[model samples]
Each structure stands twice: as structure tokens, then as C-alpha cells.
Target chain A: FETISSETLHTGAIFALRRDQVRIVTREVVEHFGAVAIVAMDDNGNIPMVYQYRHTYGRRLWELPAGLLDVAGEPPHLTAARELREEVGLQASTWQVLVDLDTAPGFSDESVRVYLATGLREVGRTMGWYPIAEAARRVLRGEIVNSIAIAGVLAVHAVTTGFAQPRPLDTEWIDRPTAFAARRAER
Target chain B: FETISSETLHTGAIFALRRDQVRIVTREVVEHFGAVAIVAMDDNGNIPMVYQYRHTYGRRLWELPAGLLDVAGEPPHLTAARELREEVGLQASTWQVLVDLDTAPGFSDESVRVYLATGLREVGRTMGWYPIAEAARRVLRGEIVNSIAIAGVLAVHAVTTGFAQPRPLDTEWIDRPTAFAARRAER
Candidate 1:
């Protein structure tokens, strides 16, 4: 369906909301800059995750180191690497795109890509980092509620157990053309 | 931090938009009734999925049977079962909660519980159903972009390949309290 017109309803530091009158129905689009999540694994097979408080959830959640993909002209892998360093004060010598997810396809074009990182080194100190056992138990026990974290933990498990193979770092991410990022860039 | 006030900006058939003035920042909250996704697996370990067109993405995405949790007083599992029957016309003698995912914790509190339904029987056929091979390949190759589907497929893969175990059907789903659904219900 084609949009007849759209009016910006609200804008914030992280996202924007716009009302679009499509030919079929009037809909509101949640515009996001998208994001990249890191599955940073050390030599001992531990994936370091952060327990951060999110206002939307009103509690702390165990999530992979992630950041918005709003840096102009920066590639997603670079964003992943930067988030790992900033959030957890860690760096990885290797990086590969593990999975990409459209967080909510029904109302938003927001997407995120999960990256697998190895050869880890600590660059700084961070908070609430969980090892493999802790992370796995949290996820399986339904303690980790984030979708990207759930997908990341399971995809990493699938790879380690030989149940699945990881795609190359240069895998094509099928980002929807209707995303706000693209539209904003055009303006 | 608490909400100072909120104003409804837009209301559509599927969702509503409300701007919340919190102590720290003014944010837009997308009101939704939550959702459920079903991993309807057959006896031969084949998961039946659908390739439905999502207007937001402007393409047909391969996703599990899913629908909103807006039946007023219906439970989530019942919603899951109903979605499976309505979308794919399938039924299962066994059901378990595979994973619970918060679709977008960064901005929205939309959460979905992915269920594992085995002992399957196809009461009818639906469009774009993918069995085990096609589903696995599509998910692993990043052809499926929906976050719930990504987590469900990989989590089911981990369980089937002996890498992980499925949680009980009674797993608690953590729905964020600040969602628009709860606020609207209070009114």
C-alpha cells in the first residue's frame, strides 16, 4: 500500500512517531534508527551480557551489548563492535553477522542485527555481566525477556552444538525500505 | 521516575499512540494488547509456518502462527492455540512454552510467548506452510526477519538437536507494567 500523506506526531532522542494515511488504513509508524547487538564470547565460551534497567519494562533486563545504528555512514558491524566496547568495555578480534530481526513488523519497521564476536579482550569495566551458564539459565528460566537476547542465546547455542552454521560477517541484512532511518536520511 | 501525564495522539484499528511525560523524558508509547506465536510441530519434527504479507515490511514474511492477545479475558495459551487453528487450522495434543520474548523493550513493552506444540495433526491446510527443512534453512540463512519467529525457530532447533530444553507450558511471561493496554483497561 502507498501512503497518501504522513504527519509527524512526536519525536524523541531515540525514536519518532508518524501517522501515515495509507490507501488501505490509517496507521502509525514507530520510526527507529535500528540497532546492532553483540554476542561477545570469550575463549572460555562465555557470552558477556549486561543487566540494565529499561524504563519501558520498569525493571532490569539481561541483554547483549547493543547500540543504535544511527552513526551516519558507519556499517552495522562497526556499530556492534563499538557497542561491545562501550557497554561492556570489551573488544573482539573476530566478528560475524549471526542473525537479523524485525522487532515488531506489525506497526514498526525497526530492525536489529545480532553479531557473534570472539577473541575477546576486556577494555573496561561494566555492570552485571553474565557467563554462559548464568545467561543460559536466565534465558531458559524466562528471566531474560528481551527478544534479541533470546534469539542471540539460542542462535549461539545452535552454532556451538553444531545444530546450525553461522553465516559470514557480510551477510545481507534485508532492511525494510519504509524505515524512518531511510526517510530521515532523505530529508 | 513516574509519569506526569499522557495524551492520546492517534488511535487506529491495530494500535494506539500515547505520549507520556515522564520525569526524565517525554516518550511515545505504542499501545498493544500483546501477542502469541505458535511453533506447531508435527510428528516428523516438522514445524508448520506461514508466509504472510506484512504491510509494514511491504513483503511476505515467513512467520509462525501469531495474533494479538486482545480477547479481553482470554488466556495467552488459549490465544496461541486459537491462532494456530485459525491461521493454519492445526491442533496439537501437547503444548509447552518454548520462549517468551519482549519484542521491543527499548521503546515498547510488546511481548510474545512462543509455544512448542507437538503431537500435531493438520485439520486443514494454509498458505505458505514451511516444513522442517525449509523453515530451518530460511531462519538460519536470515530469510525470516520477524523477531519472534527467529527466537522460536532457533530455540526449537536447540531443543531438538539436544542443545537446549523447552520450558514448561506454565512459564511466566513478563509483561511490562507501563504498557498502554493496562492503562487503557484501568479507564
Candidate 2:
């Protein structure tokens, strides 16, 4: 449906909230410059994760080392690599597209491009590593509440167990959210 | 971090845009009632999905049969069953919690309770059934762009392939979002 009207409600560090009247209904949307998360597994089958405070949840929660696509013209794979270095102080010689998620598509253009990174090397180190299956157990036990973390953990499990295969590093993320980035770039 | 103050930027049908001042940072948050999705895998290993137009993406996209927990005090499993019957015209005798996802934890408390539904029975009809693995292929092929749909698809695949197990129907969703629902009830 075509939009009837849209008004910016507020702008802030991570997202801009907007109200849009469309042919179907009026929606409150959080426009975000997309984001990327890395599920970096080491040879021993442990995935590194970090605890970052989330205002929405009002607490520090475990999440994959991730960052926003806030750097204009920088692709998400690069964002993933950068975040791996910045958040977890590590880097991967090999990379591949693991999963892409539109985190809040019902009323937000916030998407997460998840990558699988291996061939680990250190660059910088506040992170924890869990046995991959243990991470899945944490998700089941309700210890891991972050959705992107859950998605990546499960997808990685599926891959290690041979339930699925990972795409090449240059796999095209066709559904990446561009409207938000375009608007942010315009600003 | 503790919240210092908050201003309601806008309230719409599905979410509320709020500006909150916290110790670490100020945030623009999308307060949401949270949601639930059902993966009703038939005996033939087919899952039912629906095409709904999402305002965030401005397009009709394929997603799991899902709905919000708007009815206060309604457990998410009940919401999942009702959505299954309402959106896909099918009911299931056996229901188990498959996956719990916090879709937009970075900027919104919009969590999704994904349930595994089996023993299908027809109750009502705008839906398509695809082989479960085919649905996963679509996800990788960039066809199913909705994150909730992608999570449910992969989690269900894991269960059927013996990679993971579903929690009982009475499983507690510890991280379910309640602030928005509480505020809405106050209104």
C-alpha cells in the first residue's frame, strides 16, 4: 500500500521513530540504519558473545558482537568485521552470510545482516565464549533473550550439525533495508 | 540503567514512540505489545504461511501466521493458536513452544513467541503451504524477508531434524514484554 503521509516523531542515537498514514492503516515505525551481527565460532565450536546494555530492555543483555550500518557507503560485511574487532577484539580470515533478519518488520525498517566468521585472530577483549550447543541451551533456558542472538545461535547450530550450509561471504542480502539508510544519508 | 524521564512522542495502533532519558544514554524506543507466531507443521512436513502487506517494508511479504498479544492476560500460546486458526483456517491439537525471539531488542521490546503446532484440523482460507525445507530455501534465497518467519522456519526445521526439541505448551516466556501492555491497560 502507498503511504498517505509520514511525520518524523523523534530522532535519536540508534533509530528515528516516525508515524506514517498509509492506505491501509497508520503505523508507528522505527527507522534504523540497519545493523550487522557476527557469530564468530572458533575451532573448538565456541561462539563469542558480549553483554551490552539495551535501553529498550533497560539492562545489559547478551548479544552477538554487532554494530549498525551507520557508516554511509560501508557494506554490512565490513560492518560485521569492524564490529568483531571493536566489540569482541577479534577478526576472522574467512567470512560468510549466515542469516538476514528484519527485526521489526511489522512496524520498523530495522534489519540485521548476520555473518559467520571463522579463522579467528585477535585484534583487540570483553567477551564470553560458550559451547555452541550450550548457547542453544541458554536460548531454551531463557537466558538469552536477544532475538538476533537466538537466530544466529540456532542457524550456526544447524550448520555445524549439517542441517544447512552457509552462503559465500559475498552472498547478496537482497532484502536489506535501504529506506532508512537513504533517509539518514539525506540528513 | 535507570530511566530518568520519558516523553511520549506518538502513539499508534501497533506501537508507541517514546523518548527516554536514561543514565547511559537517551533513547528513542518503540514500545510494543509483543507478538506470537505459529509453525504448524503438518504430517507431510508442510508449513502454512500468509502474505501480508507490511508498512515498514511497504510491500506484501510472506510471513508465518502470527498476531499480537493485545488481549491482556491472554497467554501467548493461546494467542498463537487463535492466530493459527484465524490467519490460516487451521487448528492444532498438539502445541509446544518452539522458539522465543526478541525481534527488536535494540530499540523495541517486541518479542515473538513461536509455537510448534501439529495435529492439524481445519476450522475456517487465505494461505499457502510449502514443504518445510522449501520454506528454508526461500529464506536463504531472500524470498521470506520477515524475521519472525525466518526464526520459526529454521527452529521448526531443527526440531523435525532432531537438532532441537520443543518446550511444553506451558513453558514460561520469561522475557515477554509487559511495559507497553501495562501502559495500554492503564489507558
Candidate 3:
């Protein structure tokens, strides 16, 4: 699965402001679950992916199509499937839950699930969805996360349910640096 | 329970040139769990006590003193007990795991389990410690999410093994709003 784009909501209070309530914008990213398939006729077939420069890590990651589900009453999974079609113009016959994850717990109350899709075939059409407002579209391009695409895709790889059977928890549990340190120190 | 402050790490390589790796420097909101107390004073003075916060969603969110785990590596239960002592300077002779939950499932990976702490009394003389560098004398400030806290505590209380049963599978298959509309409006 992948995130094609994101929708950022710039919100302001309609009444009195509280300490915890800030007029900050919320960025919600959604991803689609499209299985990879190539045309039998050509070796030069393409799979959909997200492309963005991560300012925090300072890298342009080739991310899967992903984004947010702020479509009001839409269910989370429905948001995922819709993103796939809207971003990549590809469709998958079978869709299943892979992993439900929270992005950041410290501040935002944002969360999303990653899904896997198989049997990809192009619909021969593209979507006309742009997140930026007409005013900001000209100056400030946009920012999105690429690792999210990778993590979302990997998380939905047909794993057992939350209680498959005395299953070992597969969460990595640590950031990249700590993992590397343990490996080097063991030697 | 509270997010004093935080920082974002922006150190990964540039996924693309001129693309900024947006690093949001903020505190990792620490979360701990504890239960209510019915304390009795000396001469049959049953304290009709309540904590009040008449902000945000109106009526105060009357609650026991709660906070996030201050130190790392402590077991979830131990973390809960420690927070009780540090925040209100209360000590609990007994503690129980009321609930455990993954606060969010979209961006970051964070888990918190609520605990029922009884036999409350002022004990610890000093506030608990936090990690240096990551948690140090910096004394930073920021915000956190409470929905995560409520979900963690209440969900734990609802189940047996400090975890709720897996969500029932969505009986419906495929994504089609029109189909749903047709079904709902069926004769």
C-alpha cells in the first residue's frame, strides 16, 4: 500500500480557547492497498508509489501512496481503499486488514491502518485531487512522510489477527539507532 | 497523562534534494495508569473530594492524579505506581492493571495501560526522575492526547486479560457506498 497525498486541515476555534486547544493545523495521511502486478507484454511496467522529501530525516523517500481519512463520516478502511484508486488509479480485488497504527501519541489524536491489496490492474484513468488550498498552492508546495508508506505496506502483509494464537508480538519496540547499537555492542 | 514538552528528530538522509525533513521537536507525552480512591480522614470525615477542570468540553473531567511514565524501562505496573507518588505525592499499597491499549495506530507507536491504585497516601518527598538529553533538566513544555488515556484505561477495565477481544470482523465485504445506499433503501 502507499500514500499518494495528504490533506491538512487548518482549524480555528469558534469560541473561547482553552490551554490544551491550539489553532494548529492537523495533517492526516491515507494510503491505498494495491498489489503489485506487471503487464505480460512489457518489462517496463510501473507500480504506484509516493514521492516526498522528509525534512526531519532530510531524505526524499519513495513512499507508497498514503494520506489521511478526514472525509467526515467515512470509515477508516474505506478511506484506505479510496486512496488507492484516487492516487494510483489501480484496483485490487481482495482487501484485508494488515495493521492498525497510531502516528504520534505525544500531541495529535491521529491514527490509521495499513492494508494490502492484490490483483492490480490499471483503470486507465487518473484522479484530480489536490490537497493544497488555491491560495497556498502557489508558494508552499507540500510535505509528506515516505517511511509511513513503507511501514503501512509491511504492516498489512497478511498477518494473523491481534490474537492469532499465543503469538509473539512483532512490534520492533525501538527506533533505528537503538537497534543498530545493540547489534554493534553484541560483537 | 501530561505532555510537558517534546522534540522531533530530523536526522535521516535526504529522500530528495531541496526537500526539508520536517522535525517536530516535542516531548514524548508520558502516560501512566491509576484508579480512584475513597480516602477517609480522622473523625469520620469522609472527604467528598473531586478534581475539577471546567474547560474544553465543559464539565470538569473529575479524575484521580494521573501522568505518563517518567523513566524508561520500568514495567508498565511499576510505572503506574511511580506516577501516583510523583504527581500528587500519593502512595498506593495495592495496584491493579485496569486496561492496556495502543493509544494511536496511525503515525507513532505508543502503548499505555491503566492501573487501579488503592490505599492512597502522601509518601514520596520529591518528583520522579526523567532521562537526560531526551528527558533532562531542560524543563520543556508541550501538549498530549487524553482520548488515548481514556481508551487505555476504560478498555482494560472492560476486559479480562487487561486486553479487549479482537474487534469482530466487518461482516460486509468490498467498498461501495452506492451498494450500501441501495441496501439500506431496499424495499
Candidate 4:
């Protein structure tokens, strides 16, 4: 699609809505700073998850510790580590790239990098942990609906069970930097 | 976060942008119709993937057969089956829910239910297919970054290797009926 002109529809603290006039289509995309999510798995195979209320959904959902990469040029892994610590007050000795996902490609360029955080130590926890089995059940029952959490949990299950291998921690993200994040950082 | 007042910024053909005024946060979320993606695996352990050009990303990403639930009141499974046929012209005898992903939950409620499709028969070939092995390599190389495809491929790998179990096809979507799809249909 050829983008002819663009206009900022709305700008918020976290995200912005931008309207782009393209050939035969007008695309309004939610420009967001690509974020990071951490699957902090402990020695006993229990994964710590955050039970928080999502205002958009109007309900509490279990999701992996995640946050936006708002800090200009912050590496995904560092963001992952920081989010894990700030959200759950946990630190991981081992960190590796689990999977990178382009969350909504159809309308938005929102992307997420999910990291595998092992050898964990709890600094604090107001929430609780989810065992693999319990998380699997929740997934089947449609309880764990968060995209990052769902992908991360299933991926961890696969790796722990020896079904799949993960990529290296230094995997290059060819799609470096999003428009919204870079623009917001520049401001 | 508490939403104070919301306004429709723009209503396009595919999605609508709404600016929600909230306490301590002004959120602009893209109202969308949740979609479905299918991982159509053949008898020879091959998975059919579409190499389509995404205007949003400005690149051709290898992705599963996916489509929107824009047909008013269309169930996700029916959308999955219809997209599979329309995109690749394939039919599957066995279908089961693989995973549910909330792409960009922080900004948009665009959810996708990935289905594992087996017992395949090819009726059309508008786009080619990707073998499981090749797809795995591309994933490792960060070639396949679409969230649904990334999650679905890994999940299939786990299930095929006996690491994870697939959920039933009739898995209930507790977060049913997105605002855009429902509202558009009503209009």
C-alpha cells in the first residue's frame, strides 16, 4: 500500500493512534513501543505470572511479566530483565531469547520479544506462581488469554519437555525499532 | 486505569480508532474484529504457510492462513476454515484449537485463535506451502515473526513431538464479541 499522507489522530502516554492515507485504504494504526515479556521459570518448573487487572478487558488476567521498551534504544533483553525485576521483583541468572512475535501485523506494527528467564530468585511477589500443568489447564480452559503469556508458557513447556530448542540470546532483530517508540523517544 | 471519556477518532474499512480518556492515561485503542489462524499440517508432516506481503510491515512474511471474523456473528472456527479454503484452497478433516493469542493487548484487543489443522487435502494453491523443517529453520533465523505463526509453529512442533496436547475444537472463547466487529455488524 502506498501511504500518501498521515495524521496523528490521538496521542497518549503509552500509545498513539495515527491515520495513514494509503492507496484505496485508510489505515489507522495504534503506534506503540515494541515491548518485552519474560517467562521467569524457577528450578521446580513453576513459572511466575502476574495477575493484574487489564482495564481494556475489564477483568484480571494472568500474563507474563512484561513492559514496553520506552527507554530509547533499550535492547530487548535488557527490557525483559528490567520488566521481570520491576513487575515481579525477581532476577534471573540465565537469560535467552525464547521467541519474537509480531503481535498485530494486520493493522499495527506492534511487536514483542519473549525471553526465557531461568535460575530465578524472588525479590518480591504480591501475586503467585503457575505450574506448567496448571498453566496448561488454564490455557485449555481459555483462562490464560494474554498473547505473550500463552506463547511463552507453551514454548517453555515444549523446551522443558524436550520438544523444541530455543534460539540464542543474541538473535538479531532485523525489525529494529518501531516508529512510535523512536518518535516518542525523540520527543 | 479508569476510562473517563472515549471518542471515535476514525472509522476505516478494516478498523476503527477510539481515544479513551482515562485517569492518569489517555489511551487510543484500535477497535478490531478478532481473527483466526490455521496451521494446516499435511499427512507428510508438512505445514502450509503463506508468503504474503504485509503492507504494515512492508515485507513478505511467512504466515499461516489467517483471516478476520468480519462476517457478522461468524464463529472463529468457521472463519478459520473459510480462510484456509480461500487463501490456500485446502480442507482438513481434523481440526483442534492450538492456542489463543492477544496481540498487542496493551493497546488493542485484537485476539487470534490458532487452530491445528490435520488430515489435509489440497484443492487450490494460490500460495505455496512450507515444510515443517524449513519453517523451523526460518523461525530460528527470525524470518517468521508473525505472532500467530510463530506461536502456532512452535506449538505444533511440541505436539508432534509429544510435548504438548491440543485443546478441543470447541474451546470456549470467554472474551467473545469484540467491540468493532459487533458494532460494525450492527451498523
Candidate 5:
């Protein structure tokens, strides 16, 4: 889509708002730095999750260890490692791309990469940990409502159950958004 | 979480922006009317999808047929049926909850519930129909990247293959957002 005109509406703490005139219609867009989530499992079939306090929802939520690609010099993989370490006090030796998601293509230019991290060892963290099946159960029970975690948990369950395969660690993510970071650097 | 104060930052065509002060820090939030997506499958193992232009990403994306719950009196289940009929010109006699997602819990109060629709018959239109495996393949190939669609597709594959099961049609969606629609009606 070609933009006829563009305007910046709001610059918030993490996301920015922009209006794009495309095909004679205005589109309200949320530009985000993009983020990463890890379906980090121990050798015995448990995945680590963190119950994060979400201000947007006015409640705490059960979610995978995730964070945005806010650091300019860091790549997504490194960001995943850092977030995994800091949130769960763990590290993974084997990593693969489980899936890549365009979080809200209708109104947001945000993307998230979910990774499958195996070969785990404690690094620095009581975080919520559950068997992959139990994790998927909470998704249905509405106990785990975070989008990123739901995607990761259900996916890892699929992989373990022989329904899906994890992609290589260097899998290409064509839709990952870096433009939001570029815009942030402009200030 | 108790909000110490709140401020409206931007009110756009779709999402409204607000800032809430909690404790000692402020949170930037995008308030959105929650949406519904359908993973409508034929008895022959094909799922219908839409290739729609996303101005936020400045390109077209292969996504599940979805629409926001902008109508004040509509429940999410009805919204799913309406969107399915409008986008693909078909209706399903069988509907069940596949998964519900909190699209961007860190910054947006947006939720999406994906439904598995079967017993489908036409009303009108040509839709892109792909086999379930092909659709999941595209997700790994970065072709089907829409977050809602990926979650739906992957979850359905799990259900069909016995890794997961669909919830009842009237399954409770604890995180569905109607407050944004109420906020919109006030304007």
C-alpha cells in the first residue's frame, strides 16, 4: 500500500501512534519496537512462565518470559536471551524459532518472534513453571491470557506431540518490524 | 491495579490512546474493542483465509477472517458469525472456542477469540482455501504471519491431530474487552 500522506499523532513511552492515508482512507496505526517470547523448556518437559502485572489489563497475567527489542544495538535473539535470563533466572543452550507473529496487523505494526529454548540451566530466579500440557490447559481455562504466552505454550505442545516442527535458529523473519525502533532513534 | 489518575491522549478511528498513573509510573495504553477470528474449515480439511492489505505493515497479509466487536450490543460469538458471513459469505452450524488471545497485553487492552467453525455452507464470494497442513506450513515460512491467524491455525491443527480440543460454543471468555466499545459509544 502506498501512503498518500502521514502524520504522527502520539509518542508514548513504548509505542508511538501514526496516521497513514492509504488508498484514500485513513489508518490508525500503533508502531511498536516488536518483541520476543521464549517457550523455554527444561529437559524434563516443563516450561518457565512469569505472571506479569499488566497495566493495560488492570491485572496480573500469566505469560512467557518476554520483552521488547528496545535496545538499538541488540538483535532479537540476544533480546530473547536477556529477557529469558532476567525473568526466569535460566539459560538455554539450544534455541529454535517456533513461530513469528504479526501481533495486530489490523491496527499495529508490531511483530513477535516465539522461540523454543531447550537445554536449560538456572542462571539468577520463583517463576511459574508448568508442564506444557498444563500450560495449554490454562490457555483454555483463561488463566493464561497473554497472547504471546498462549501462542508459545500451544505451539510447544504441538511440537512435542508430533504435530509441528520447530524451525532452525536462523530462520528468516521477513515481517519483523524494525521501523518502529528507527523512529524511536530519531528522537 | 488502582489507577492514581488517567488521561486521554489520542482518540482515533479505531483505537483510543490513554495514559494511566499507577503507583509512581505512567502506563501508555491503547484501548481497543476486542475482535473475533474464525478458523472455518470445510469437511475436506481446507481452511478459508483472507489476503487483506494492512496499512500498519504497508503490505498485504494472509489472515483469518476477523472483525472488531465495535457494535455495542453484540456478543463475541455473534460477532464471529457475522464476520464469517461478511468476509467469506458462508455460515457454519458448528462453532466452538479454539483459543482466546490478549493481543498486546503490555500496551493494548485488545483481546481476540478464535473460533473453530465447521458445518459450513456458502452464502456468496471466492475465498482463499488452503489445506490445514499447507496453512501451517505457510506460517512457518513467514507467509501467514498475522498473529490471530497463526494462533487459530496452529491451535486447530493441534485439535485435529489430538494435541488439543475445542471448547464449547458458549465458552467463557474472561478477558474480552467491551469497555472500549462503551468508550466509543460515549463519543
Candidate 6:
């Protein structure tokens, strides 16, 4: 009912900080905002980029081309297409707006908007506008983050298409936290 | 859909990198997660937090007490109440699962289970523990995120109680890009 871009983060992080309140951190943002990505297949028969090193987890993680909406008056779909262009420098002619859900419902208002972008064409270089520079910088500084991008892409695809695909991220995508927690508890 | 842990990201700055991939970022995590936070009012009756930070360009934000459902075989509503306690140190005796939207329909399998957590009570210390090093590292590092908490709290409030009360993050939170683009063209 309102028009706005992603709010300008004070410290460049997506959430607004309380005056001095402290709190716990959770994967809710990873679950919610991370889900708001554009899903586009190769239209002109081009190979898509799908994997990279996630500094947070310390491994080359499977992923898609995506980012969060950080400007005021910015829409998720448009943000999706913008990411499509910015990351891989590709653009899609066809676009579809999808549902909104909280990926990390417990800890963040990081619900996502899934967009299906079709008619892909690689035209230019990546804009390389990353929103989590605070986190990404850690990666540059040698922090480990097996980024959840691949799982994020697959999730978006599955929800939109209403079917899961045979992607690498699918194996550890949906039920990752459980296994991780179990492993941690065992240790 | 997954369960991950309490790692404190001490990096002061974060950025979002993308393509078809989405990174929900930590700040978003806090906004959504903290949706259950109560904004203190004159009567101390506790109003759900929903306001615009004009200094930050009048960005509309909200909060809630929610978390991720990454625990193995854990029900979504249970996760919500658990999160309410863990994150906000409060527990809701009554909890209801409301809207479940695919955050990213075209990209991820991320689904947010919105829960209405009522019958609140204060609980001491988080049930789950964060590593000492991680907690200490992030003690004064920078901003943490919790958007889904806000969204879960406000959005559910909006759906079941209408916007008259405090609202959390919703599909309606941000701007619509294409619609604006069309409007711009019209202008």
C-alpha cells in the first residue's frame, strides 16, 4: 500500500538498529531475504553461473545471482532483475512476480520476493553491488562462508515451479540447519 | 526448513553481492526476527513496533519475536514460540500459524510460516547458547538483523488483527518496481 525503495541502512546492514538494545542473531534473514531472488534459465542457450565461495561458511557454496532490496521505493522483482544484470550482467525479457515468505521467520523480517526472469541475454559486465559488504569483506579477509546461494536459488525455483529440481544445492538446501545442529550437538 | 547456529559475525560492515542469488544479510535477519519486540508507549501497554526512521529516509520498519525452522522435524509454530523466547526472552503461551508464502517463488524453496504468538511471558536467558568467542566478538562489533521477526509479528497482526495494531514485515513492505517503472513511463 506504499511506495518505497529498500531503506538506507545506517551501518549498511539491512536491519534498523535499536538505540542500544541488544539481541540474538538467527538465520531468519538468510531464510527470508535470501529467498527473494530472480530465477532465470538460459534463454539463448547460455551457461549460468551458480557457485562461489561463501565467506560465512568457509567453502565454495552453490548459489544464484541475487541480492537484497536496500533502497527506498525498490520492489523485489525489480531488485531481482537488477541483480540478474548486476551480478552476471545478464537481463531477462520476461519477468514474473511471485510470493513473499519469511526465510528466517524467527529472527528477521527478511521475507523474500521470488521472480522468474526469462529471455536471458548477457550484455555487459557485472555491476557488483553487494549488500553484505560487512560480511563479504570478511570473506575477502579469509573468513569462511559456504554461502547458501545455491539452496536459495533452488528454493525459489521450487516454490515458483511447484517442483524441486536436480540441482547440487538441493541436497543440503532444505534441511541444512537440522543436520548442522545435530553435527554441532554431537561435537 | 533448515537449522543453523549462533555464530556472531563481528565484521562491522556487510555488503550484498548478487545475480540470480539472494543474500538476506544479518540486519534483515534482526528486523524480521525482532518483529515481536514491543515499542514502549506512554501507558507501557506495549505497542508492536512499526515506525519510519526519518533520519534513515523515512524507511518503514517493524519487529517480532520469531526465528528459523531449521531444527530437525520441528513444527513451524513451535519454532516461532521458541524463537520468541530465545530472541526476545519472551514466550507466548498461545501460538498460531498464519500465512505461509514462498519468499522467493521463482528462486528459493524458502517458505516463511507466520505465527501469532500471544499469552506472553518473560523467560530468562536463551535456551540455545552462543559460543563465548562468537558472542564476545560481536558484543560491540556492529548492527545485527532480525526483520522476519518483525514481519512475522506485524504481518500476522495485519492479517488476523488488521493494520490497526502494530504490523510486522509483509509482502506489502517494500515498493513495486515495475509498477513504478510503468508509472514513470506514464508520467
Tell me the whole-model lDDT of each prediction, alpha carbons only. 0.78, 0.82, 0.30, 0.77, 0.84, 0.34
Tens digits of per-residue lDDT, candidate 4, A17-76, equal 777877767677667787889888899889988898766665678898998888887778
Task: Give the residue spans of candidate 1 off by over 4 A.
Answer: A1-5, A21-23, A124-134, A176-178, A182-187, B21-23, B124-134, B176-179, B183-187
Sort by TM-score, best first: what order? Answer: 5, 2, 1, 4, 6, 3
Residue B3 of model 4: what lDDT? 83
Least well predicted 10-residue stretch by lDDT in candidate 2 chain B? B178-187
Show the lowest summed lDDT stretch of 10 residues, model 4 chain A.
Answer: A177-186
Top-TM-score structure, candidate number: 5
Q: What is the C-alpha lDDT profile of model 4 across B104-148, one tens digit per residue?
A: 677776778899998888786536677766676566556788878
Instruction: Name the top DockQ candidate.
Output: 5
What is the per-residue lDDT of model 6 for residues A1-187, given as tens digits with 9 covering 90 to 100? 3322232222223333212111322111222123345556553322244455432222343345667554344555666777778777788887654223334332223444445566877787412222222222222222211122322332333333333222221111211112111222221
lDDT of 3 by residue, B20-56 (tens): 1124332221111212221111122111122433222
Backbone clashes under 3 angstroms, per model:
0, 0, 61, 0, 0, 113
How far residue B70's Cα lies from its native spot in candidate 1, in Å, is: 1.7
Report chain B TM per candidate: 0.88, 0.93, 0.38, 0.91, 0.95, 0.40
- In model 2, state the lDDT of residue B21: 83
Tens digits of per-residue lDDT for model 6 on B58-162?
133333333443343444455556655555666665544433333322222233444545566667951222222222122112111123332232233233322
* Tens-digit lDDT string for candidate 2 (B1-187): 6889899877777777788888756777778898999999999999999998777877788899999989989978888888898888898999998888888887887778889899999886456999988897787656776888888887788677776788887788766788788777355
The alpha-carbon root-mean-square deviation between model 2 and the true structure, to one decimal in Å, is: 2.3
Candidate 3: docking tier: incorrect
Winner on TM-score between 4 and 5 is: 5
Please give each candidate's TM-score. 0.89, 0.92, 0.30, 0.87, 0.94, 0.34
Q: Is candidate 1 or candidate 6 better by lDDT?
A: 1
For residue B156, model 4's alpha carbon misses the true position, in angstroms, by 2.7
